[PDB]
Scaffold this active site. Structure first.
Site, PDB file in Angstrom:
ATOM      1  N   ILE B  23      55.431  34.050  35.646  1.00  0.00           N
ATOM      2  CA  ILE B  23      54.286  33.153  35.769  1.00  0.00           C
ATOM      3  C   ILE B  23      53.119  33.619  34.902  1.00  0.00           C
ATOM      4  CG2 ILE B  23      54.857  32.308  38.072  1.00  0.00           C
ATOM      5  CD1 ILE B  23      53.047  34.393  39.248  1.00  0.00           C
ATOM      6  N   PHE B  25      48.527  40.692  25.971  1.00  0.00           N
ATOM      7  CA  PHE B  25      48.219  39.759  27.047  1.00  0.00           C
ATOM      8  C   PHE B  25      48.712  40.286  28.392  1.00  0.00           C
ATOM      9  N   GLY B  26      50.013  40.541  28.479  1.00  0.00           N
ATOM     10  CA  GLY B  26      50.613  41.035  29.705  1.00  0.00           C
ATOM     11  C   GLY B  26      51.465  39.987  30.396  1.00  0.00           C
ATOM     12  N   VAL B  28      52.957  38.482  33.485  1.00  0.00           N
ATOM     13  CA  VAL B  28      52.772  38.446  34.932  1.00  0.00           C
ATOM     14  C   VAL B  28      54.002  37.878  35.632  1.00  0.00           C
ATOM     15  CG1 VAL B  28      51.358  37.614  36.834  1.00  0.00           C
ATOM     16  CG2 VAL B  28      50.297  38.119  34.625  1.00  0.00           C
ATOM     17  N   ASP B 134      35.445  43.050  31.381  1.00  0.00           N
ATOM     18  CA  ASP B 134      35.992  41.728  31.096  1.00  0.00           C
ATOM     19  C   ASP B 134      35.895  40.814  32.318  1.00  0.00           C
ATOM     20  OD1 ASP B 134      37.253  39.602  29.846  1.00  0.00           O
ATOM     21  OD2 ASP B 134      39.275  40.372  30.204  1.00  0.00           O
ATOM     22  N   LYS B 136      35.472  37.435  33.477  1.00  0.00           N
ATOM     23  CA  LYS B 136      35.507  36.025  33.116  1.00  0.00           C
ATOM     24  C   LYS B 136      35.664  35.162  34.359  1.00  0.00           C
ATOM     25  CE  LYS B 136      39.079  36.316  30.523  1.00  0.00           C
ATOM     26  NZ  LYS B 136      39.384  37.734  30.852  1.00  0.00           N
ATOM     27  N   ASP B 151      41.750  41.762  37.506  1.00  0.00           N
ATOM     28  CA  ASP B 151      41.655  42.230  36.120  1.00  0.00           C
ATOM     29  C   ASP B 151      40.340  42.963  35.868  1.00  0.00           C
ATOM     30  OD1 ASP B 151      42.974  40.665  33.103  1.00  0.00           O
ATOM     31  OD2 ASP B 151      42.128  42.667  33.403  1.00  0.00           O
TER      32      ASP B 151
HETATM   33  C1  LIG Z   1      49.419  32.517  41.408  1.00  0.00           C
HETATM   34  O1  LIG Z   1      48.912  32.771  40.095  1.00  0.00           O
HETATM   35  C2  LIG Z   1      48.593  34.085  39.933  1.00  0.00           C
HETATM   36  C3  LIG Z   1      48.176  34.908  40.975  1.00  0.00           C
HETATM   37  C4  LIG Z   1      47.870  36.240  40.709  1.00  0.00           C
HETATM   38  N1  LIG Z   1      47.469  37.048  41.701  1.00  0.00           N
HETATM   39  C5  LIG Z   1      47.159  38.391  41.440  1.00  0.00           C
HETATM   40  N2  LIG Z   1      47.269  38.894  40.139  1.00  0.00           N
HETATM   41  C6  LIG Z   1      47.669  38.072  39.161  1.00  0.00           C
HETATM   42  N3  LIG Z   1      47.807  38.472  37.898  1.00  0.00           N
HETATM   43  C7  LIG Z   1      47.323  39.661  37.538  1.00  0.00           C
HETATM   44  C8  LIG Z   1      46.017  39.816  37.088  1.00  0.00           C
HETATM   45  C9  LIG Z   1      45.566  41.076  36.709  1.00  0.00           C
HETATM   46  C10 LIG Z   1      46.421  42.174  36.787  1.00  0.00           C
HETATM   47  O2  LIG Z   1      46.009  43.418  36.413  1.00  0.00           O
HETATM   48  C11 LIG Z   1      45.024  43.968  37.176  1.00  0.00           C
HETATM   49  C12 LIG Z   1      44.130  44.844  36.574  1.00  0.00           C
HETATM   50  C13 LIG Z   1      43.115  45.429  37.318  1.00  0.00           C
HETATM   51  C14 LIG Z   1      42.998  45.141  38.672  1.00  0.00           C
HETATM   52  C15 LIG Z   1      43.894  44.268  39.280  1.00  0.00           C
HETATM   53  C16 LIG Z   1      44.910  43.684  38.534  1.00  0.00           C
HETATM   54  C17 LIG Z   1      47.728  42.006  37.226  1.00  0.00           C
HETATM   55  C18 LIG Z   1      48.187  40.751  37.603  1.00  0.00           C
HETATM   56  C19 LIG Z   1      49.496  40.609  38.044  1.00  0.00           C
HETATM   57  C20 LIG Z   1      47.981  36.741  39.414  1.00  0.00           C
HETATM   58  C21 LIG Z   1      48.397  35.913  38.374  1.00  0.00           C
HETATM   59  C22 LIG Z   1      48.700  34.583  38.644  1.00  0.00           C
HETATM   60  O3  LIG Z   1      49.114  33.700  37.691  1.00  0.00           O
HETATM   61  C23 LIG Z   1      48.497  33.973  36.428  1.00  0.00           C
END
Ligand SMILES: COc1cc2ncnc(Nc3ccc(Oc4ccccc4)cc3C)c2cc1OC
Ligand SMILES: COc1cc2ncnc(Nc3ccc(Oc4ccccc4)cc3C)c2cc1OC
Lengths: 309, 272, 272, 309
Positions: B23, B25-26, B28, B134, B136, B151
């Site tokens: 679902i 850049f990274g 996910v 960052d 946003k 993030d």
């Molecule tokens: C249902 O749609 C989503 C729910 C998400 N919930 C929680 N983290 C996400 N993504 C996310 C966002 C940031 C991330 O890296 C982090 C960095 C610092 C602190 C927390 C997470 C890791 C992940 C997996 C998500 C992404 C989603 O779709 C784009």
């Protein structure tokens, strides 16, 4: 505005343009690459014609691409002796591809980097090509270039000087998220300030380019007192660059070396005030243009004497 | 030695972790372990053995960081080449996609409340001493509506910087004037606490004006205008007093002139 | 209204919870959800609708309480009659059973280190403003050795009080003199922050002397002796200076004379 | 020390004690209950004898019970006319059970609560029973009672006065975690201070009891100036109670009402200093005991005239 021999080369493109009903992603057998910022010199198999295919990554939904390619067909009527005749546009996996007329000489940014500095006599012929290119786009299509760079002026070994990559599909522009900036900007001071820009904004970009084409170096900031003395013959931030364009005096051509006609020409373009800046009409009747219009230069001869073929 | 971290180093019991559909850049992934959980897969840059203090101390400090306005950082483990961030799945949509999805109410009360949720989450990060950098609108989720922040703090591995140098769209106008003056070879930028309160300011603009400023202007135009402190209009109707005044505070040219999140909370609670 | 809480009110994703064998007053079950997790089952007292602020505000405040020396409070849900506390399973044994299991090293370094782990966990509770009250050696786990603290703050539902009135063995000597003066009908006792630092004192005694004081004396003997501030000996060999001096501080008759956990940490770091 | 008729009643117990080889948990058909703090008046089926079974919850491992019941067999040689003859001990599910000689009159704490206040003439007979009970335990078994309460003195309709529930199995005592305290304490001041205690510590408990048996109220704190005036005829904390035993004057029997012999008797027991306190030998030759030793009181007659049968 029409030329006898140029009427031949244009209608010779209309013939091989009807050879392709639709563009297929597998019809283009990969051959080589032009550059990135990503263009390809592929080979169409059904038509049997080599052209310049250009594609860049884009993650969009089908609801967007239906209106992207929609406004991307405006380029068809934009066929001009000074504009690269495009073919079509489609979608591939996750990137939009556009194939245009192949120019076996490449952009001027590549030519400038090879030849070092481009002679004044040649810049005169190129100068006229830009003027008519912007006029034809604004008068018959109500569209400006919005971005003039040395890398946006294509040149072939046939002697043709055409333009490429200009703002027309406003729907596609929004899709191009996270775009590159650059250490070398051709932005006009009025656009950096957020004010409305006319077709005379591209004139600034044209003038700022010509200075770089002539000295073989980006004009901003102006050279030292020892650098220019060892350039005759044959570490800043981005914001500081942009701010220098606004609150500091415009670039200038070196004296003595270039004729006064060419010196005055770029100075009429690099006026920080768009109101007093020359327009497409004033440039067309300038002393430098009228003199270079009657000049006789082996453009393809000098080109192939630098890059080959 | 500690150039690699494991999931067993975290306070949350991990006996098994499975990965579902993609679902993101990274990348996910929609993972799961007795409860829906998001999983990010990012391959770190080669070498850089000096990234001990940049991970063994940084991302590991996300332990003991629990809040209702901050996403539950499950944990993370990294092989010398690979890295996988585990976090709680947000059961809803992003604030980004909901502020542009016509048509949402977001009146005086709602908008003020949503802004109060962000500053609360950023306030907990303000206390723990961690900069979001960052920040946003794409890093905020809404559902209940329950506002959470993700993030956060993790730069370098994330976007949105990279010989022309690439800059994002939204993050460019989320930056404070001290940071909107970058060169081509750069993180290690003047990121402060007032950097985050600026980013919230453009989000606070994004809430009322339904989007972030500089909507049509090209990248170079943003850098100079925001660089010279040319803050966008707000009287585009209808705001007036009370509102828009806070915008001037969060967008102050001098970072010291901008309020802290804890100080900011009092400015929001004052109602119109 | 909010007389009952659910697992969905917690920040940790709960889609399924299963219960294993029994390993535990309160019935402690060896539950599981993608990671070994302890589950306590306690039936609350009938009626008492005034237990809103006693649960909807108390046990719910255990959210946003994350620490490496404190057990990971997974969450809890309560039907009007029933209650189930969910917490991370400690992968080891209790400090109680290891201090009496001959023979453990626990020299000058070890004992000091273990004591430093307790005060750190209690220090985080000292900041969050939550009193452990029932701080015994049976509420501390050791394995790695990784020291954690459980059964904290939750009184009334837990022991160890109940027309004779029943008092536990260990908790009786864990109390501070201001609290060792109870009647028969009583919580709602003078529990302070110095109450917890006293309890640690008898644990600090328990570490060096391998057990808690008043080893043979009957209940009534403890109440009077500790009530009159008759603190047990420490020169039972071999302690001397440095050590045992802190015992006098944590066992001060006046609660104000006892150091705080944050202040206490400096007294332990000073080495012998 | 031996009595003719008492030699009969004792050896009559030795006969029905050999009727049971081993105790089974199902042999005791539940009938009734005595109290809790939990005793049962069950009925043994093989032997066909009703006895007092006592059980309380205990969560222990098999490694502990092997040494608990081990030290619990010492009570066998402790058979005395003033000591309740026990039978045996076993384990049931999660609680240890002990069956002793049934006393159909119950403890004195129950009798005192029924009759209100017990006459001085009767307390004299009970006083002698306690003295010999402690002497027999200390001289022939080297064991003291460690806990003397009005609820620990059993009395039957046969006229017998015996003791029960005294410290002998030190292994079992540690198993009894979280024990009840009480609003009424019979602790001696020297034990509250943690100092070593002798058999004279039980004497304090005996004296403190006798005062309560005589007035029908716990002695501490002493009655008001109006309460005692309306008690003639026919809200404190635990620590404050214990502290009153230590630093405040001992309880005293009301003047005029009781004879000077009985007044002096309890005063020799309630001396806060164990050194100057009377011992088992001094009490045996006291004026009150020697007078009450020759007294003739229908003990079973007065008992059954209050509780029946
Ligand atoms: C249902 O749609 C989503 C729910 C998400 N919930 C929680 N983290 C996400 N993504 C996310 C966002 C940031 C991330 O890296 C982090 C960095 C610092 C602190 C927390 C997470 C890791 C992940 C997996 C998500 C992404 C989603 O779709 C784009
Ligand atoms: C492996 O042996 C055990 C590990 C445990 N780990 C974590 N909590 C336990 N028990 C426990 C202790 C306290 C408790 O209630 C709490 C009250 C306040 C804060 C945290 C927990 C709930 C539970 C389930 C445990 C019990 C164990 O056996 C007795």
């Amino acid at each position: 505005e029409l030329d006898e021999q140029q009427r031949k080369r244009l209608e010779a493109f209309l013939t091989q343009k009807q050879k392709v009903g639709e563009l297929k992603d597998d019809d283009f057998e990969k051959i080589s690459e032009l550059g990135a910022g990503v263009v390809f010199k592929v080979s169409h198999k059904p038509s049997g014609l080599v052209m310049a295919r250009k594609l860049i990554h884009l993650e969009i939904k089908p609801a967007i691409r239906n209106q992207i390619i929609r406004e991307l067909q405006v380029l068809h009527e934009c066929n001009s002796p000074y504009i690269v005749g495009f073919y079509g546009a489609f979608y591939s996996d996750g990137e939009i591809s556009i194939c245009m007329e192949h120019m076996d000489g490449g952009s001027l940014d590549q030519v400038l980097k090879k030849a070092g500095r481009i002679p004044e006599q040649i810049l005169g012929k190129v100068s006229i090509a830009v003027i008519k290119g912007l006029t034809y786009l604004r008068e018959k299509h109500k569209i400006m270039h919005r971005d003039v760079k040395p890398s946006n002026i294509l040149v072939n070994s046939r002697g043709e000087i055409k333009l490429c990559d200009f703002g027309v599909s406003g729907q596609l522009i929004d899709s191009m998220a996270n775009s590159f900036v650059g250490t070398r900007s051709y932005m006009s001071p009025e656009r950096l300030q957020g004010t409305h820009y006319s077709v005379q904004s591209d004139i600034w970009s044209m003038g700022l380019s010509l200075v770089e084409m002539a000295v073989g170096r980006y004009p901003i900031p102006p050279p030292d007192a020892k650098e220019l003395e060892l350039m005759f013959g044959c570490p800043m931030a981005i914001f500081e660059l942009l701010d220098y364009i606004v609150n500091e005096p415009p670039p200038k051509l070196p004296s003595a070396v270039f004729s006064l006609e060419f010196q005055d020409f770029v100075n009429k373009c690099l006026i920080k005030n768009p109101a007093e800046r020359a327009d497409l009409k004033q440039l067309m009747v300038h002393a430098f243009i009228k003199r270079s219009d009657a000049e006789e230069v082996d453009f393809a001869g000098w080109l192939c004497s630098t890059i080959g073929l | 030695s500690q150039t690699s971290i494991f999931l067993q180093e975290w306070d949350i019991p991990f006996e098994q972790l499975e990965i579902g559909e993609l679902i993101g850049f990274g990348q996910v992934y929609h993972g799961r372990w007795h409860g829906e959980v998001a999983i990010r897969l990012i391959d770190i840059e080669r070498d850089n053995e000096d990234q001990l203090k940049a991970f063994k101390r940084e991302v590991m400090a996300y332990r003991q960081t629990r809040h209702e306005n901050v996403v539950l950082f499950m944990g993370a483990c990294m092989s010398p080449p690979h890295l996988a961030i585990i976090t709680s799945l947000c059961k809803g949509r992003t604030l980004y996609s909901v502020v542009r999805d016509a048509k949402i109410v977001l009146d005086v009360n709602k908008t003020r409340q949503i802004a109060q949720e962000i500053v609360k989450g950023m306030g907990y990060l303000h206390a723990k001493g961690i900069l979001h950098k960052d920040l946003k609108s794409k890093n905020v989720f809404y559902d209940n509506g329950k506002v959470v922040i993700t993030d956060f703090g993790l730069f370098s591995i994330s976007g949105v910087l990279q010989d022309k140098l690439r800059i994002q769209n939204g993050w460019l106008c989320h930056l404070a004037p001290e940071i909107i003056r970058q060169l081509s070879p750069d993180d290690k930028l003047p990121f402060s606490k007032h950097s985050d309160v600026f980013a919230l300011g453009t989000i606070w603009y994004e809430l009322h004006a339904r989007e972030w400023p500089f909507k049509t202007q090209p990248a170079e135009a943003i850098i100079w205008q925001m660089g010279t402190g040319m803050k966008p209009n707000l009287s585009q109707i209808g705001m007036g007093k009370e509102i828009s005044d806070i915008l001037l505070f969060c967008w102050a040219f001098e970072q010291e002139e901008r309020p802290t999140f804890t100080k900011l909370m009092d400015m929001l609670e004052k109602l119109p």
